[PDB]
Amino acid sequence: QILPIRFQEHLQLQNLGINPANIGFSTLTMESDKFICIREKVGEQAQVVIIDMNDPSNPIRRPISADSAIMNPASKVIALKAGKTLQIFNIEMKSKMKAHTMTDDVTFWKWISLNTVALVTDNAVYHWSMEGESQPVKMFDRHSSLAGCQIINYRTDAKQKWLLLTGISAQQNRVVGAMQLYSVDRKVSQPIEGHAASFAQFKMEGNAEESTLFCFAVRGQAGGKLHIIEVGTPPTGNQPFPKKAVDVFFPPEAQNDFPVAMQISEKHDVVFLITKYGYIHLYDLETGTCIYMNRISGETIFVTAPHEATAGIIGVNRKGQVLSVCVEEENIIPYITNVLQNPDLALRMAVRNNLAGAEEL
């Protein structure tokens, strides 16, 4: 059978001398497909291990006293913290670029762009530009709906006008997602039940300007749902993007499963969704139509990034497998025509994203 996606194993971190005890959410970071950082204690000495994905054979270990390390998405620039102490280093320059002392512990942080670090404290969210003498600026106060959640993600639209904070907690013996969507222009927060989310830019045919889309997936008691919604006033002259809501299927033996990660391909206009217990889903961004579901593994993929090369998703599982999934550009249109029997979707996707196979419907 032809599959509309392709899997690829890039690395086993245990073949690089990474101890499996350090392959987890709190100790391994992958902020982009260019680097993986792992904090390890070897003897008495805390180290950071930096894997250059363009040179994976030669990890470099450096001593640290940081509780958290996140590499810049594009440059060998690393953000380190220990409690309230934040430091930015250019590794190649062996130089401290910037430092700041917070008045609150940072419980979650990540790079939201090439030049900005987002910081989450117990009660607020900050952006920290690496430009000039910029210090962290508060973006919004955390909503009470996320109080006592484990913060697992933070994302923004391209223009940093829509901000989304995601926490989870145990309620009624399931993992319940609490999201806060903040409008920077309107200064309004919306609490939303959700597990995974991304923003995307999408130009509707007949529109001169891109639409800003907010895509989120949730397992409620209502069952699995994926939502694709335009945020903000449509650009002048644009038609509005019509809201989509579709089902997210969980089989009977995965009654405890829930979405953990989402990446949107702007090349293919598809949504990749990964569940906690190793299901992969592919949805059309325009309509929400489910294209494909299958099981990767039992294994939790606990961190993901965009895979630039393939317009796909790359992740690491608890075994230390670095795995990517992308659209199979040669099979997806035949797969949608023949296996899904959806010649409409097939033909739309074939001309929208310039793919082969809708000559033969």
Binding site: R62, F89, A99
Partner: peptide, 8 residues
Amino acid sequence: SVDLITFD
């Protein structure tokens, strides 16, 4: 406040 990383 000391460097949180040590180089060569």
